[PDB]
Amino acid sequence: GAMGSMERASLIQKAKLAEQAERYEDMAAFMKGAVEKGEELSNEERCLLSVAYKNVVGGQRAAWRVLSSIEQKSNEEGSEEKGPEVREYREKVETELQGVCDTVLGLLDSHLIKEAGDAESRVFYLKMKGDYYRYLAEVATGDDKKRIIDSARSAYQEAMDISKKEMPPTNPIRLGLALNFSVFHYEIANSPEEAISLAKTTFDEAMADLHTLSEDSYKDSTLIMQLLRDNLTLWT
């Protein structure tokens, strides 16, 4: 590990600097090094890990979609044959994306999830596991596609079960988990009705619990509620 010689606290400090500089690949590398120190992560450190990899993989996904669209058009009737290059380059980006997903899933399995006992940590990591299997599912085409989809589903479902027992309906992690699992249903599992039902029930149950919150917590929860509403508007 190239970060093995750097202090944990220095890695966290540099992750924060990398975020300020919009250097998300560096941010992710620093946070990988911090995880590999073997200690549990704090709430803020979990956010830094998630932000770093979300930005890295988000850029890869956007690029993959551009290239996949070009590849699809290149294969339509009437298109001029232009050789293997579009497929090759889409595959290059895809392999890099899969590598990042494998890295994140590897950190979660070795050994973040097994040491995560509080709901705020365990739900967060299980949500991440669902997210990175979902990104693998977005590009998957082989014998293991159904198992990749089921791995995402299983991680999200365990997170949901814990979140419903241990967190209030307005907890932002619970809300973000539901938002993302709803997207999984809609985009990955071909289950738009489940996606819509989950988003609606999540929104309504959060609405009913807002009265318990401080002004700052209300702002946090309503922000994620608005994303649920945005998706519902897209889908209905």
Binding site: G176, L179, N180, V183, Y186, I224, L227, D230, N231, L234
Partner: peptide
């Protein structure tokens, strides 16, 4: 549209 996730 591409849906929101966090």
């Amino acid at each position: 549209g591409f849906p929101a996730t966090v």
